[PDB]
UniProtKB/Swiss-Prot annotation, chains A, B, C, D, E, F:
Keywords: Cytoplasm, DNA-binding, RNA-binding, Stress response. The keyword Cytoplasm applies. Belongs to the Hfq family. Its main location: cytoplasm. The chain holds residues 6 to 69 of 102 of the full protein. This is RNA-binding protein Hfq. It is found in: Cytoplasm. GO terms for molecular function: ATP binding; bent DNA binding; DNA binding; RNA binding; RNA folding chaperone; tRNA binding. Forms condensates in vivo, both in the absence and presence of stress, which differ in their material state. Hfq condensation has no impact on transcription but seems important for the roles of Hfq as an mRNA chaperone at the post-transcriptional level. Hfq condensation also appears important for its role as an sRNA stabilizer. Residues 4-63 form the Sm domain. Changing Q3A: No effect on Hfq condensate formation in both growing and late stationary phases. It comes from Escherichia coli (strain K12). RNA chaperone that binds small regulatory RNA (sRNAs) and mRNAs to facilitate mRNA translational regulation in response to envelope stress, environmental stress and changes in metabolite concentrations. Involved in the regulation of stress responses mediated by the sigma factors RpoS, sigma-E and sigma-32. Binds with high specificity to tRNAs. Binds sRNA antitoxin RalA. In vitro, stimulates synthesis of long tails by poly(A) polymerase I. Required for RNA phage Qbeta replication. Homohexamer. Interacts with H-NS. Changing D4A: No effect on Hfq condensate formation in both growing and late stationary phases.
Amino acid sequence: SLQDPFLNALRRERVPVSIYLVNGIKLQGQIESFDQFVILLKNTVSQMVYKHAISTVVPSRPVS
Amino acid sequence: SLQDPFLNALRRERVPVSIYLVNGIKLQGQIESFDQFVILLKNTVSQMVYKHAISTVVPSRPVS
Amino acid sequence: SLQDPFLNALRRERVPVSIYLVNGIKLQGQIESFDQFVILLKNTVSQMVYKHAISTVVPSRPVS
Amino acid sequence: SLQDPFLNALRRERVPVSIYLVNGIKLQGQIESFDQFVILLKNTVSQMVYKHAISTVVPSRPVS
Amino acid sequence: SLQDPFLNALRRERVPVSIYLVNGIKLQGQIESFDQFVILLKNTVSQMVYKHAISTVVPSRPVS
Amino acid sequence: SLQDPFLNALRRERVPVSIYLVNGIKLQGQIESFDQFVILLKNTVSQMVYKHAISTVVPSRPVS
């Protein structure tokens, strides 16, 4: 899988990301944690984001 | 899984949440119970929310 | 599962429900029968509702 | 399953149906045949309808 | 399955089709090839169409 | 499968593609890498695109 390495880096370097949902809605923050079903995104509070409703995950700066 | 621990806390502390559906529609209330397929949300009546139609689950205050 | 107990009660007490589809469209009537894939809803005619296109199931009065 | 009995009757009595897709779009005609994945609907030509994109199947008259 | 026979005929007789995506968007051309996940459609270039995002496949003339 | 050969060619010849998401949104760039779940697309930064939210993959020039 490539998801695990990719999300690991955003989580590890605490890189600010834009997650865009399948309806265009745009969420912003830092990936607190993830599992195969969900991604937890942190701003004021931790929200649970369902991967099945995610279209793309967009880092806000280049990530090694 | 992380869903189970996360939804357990909202259910246990009866934390008011905003569930946003895959079409932007915004539901509000308290998680009465959940299973892998569905989430029951309580306001005036208990409604059955299908997880596959959920985009994100947003607590209304920080949850341990 | 919780779906089976929940839909059983709406079907058994013939409780009028609003099923809202993943596109916001709102259907109304009584649950005639269900299986894991579909829900049959009755008004003038019986229509077949695919669960995968259901977002939430909303009873029109409290159900034990 | 209930789908098989339900779609069998529409196909067998050649009952005119409205299939509404997950985007609201409304298709009309008669069910030529079906399998678990798809439904063939007939008007001027036979079109292939993917069940995963179907929200509900609405007969145009009561069906035994 | 019925998909395989149906798509085989459109591909074999090089029948011009309209594929309508789950968002209403309408694509046109000829089916170059298919597998269970995807359909390749040809116009100026070959594009890869994901079946999960297809609502219906509409031939532009009757197909045996 | 046909996806693997098709995406391999876009990735190998570094062919500029338009990926259109299930909500019409149009993304552009080059396929950096892929796995069965996701496609990484490169412009200014590498973004993670979920295949389940992809409708079609459109090369910007004929690809052998």
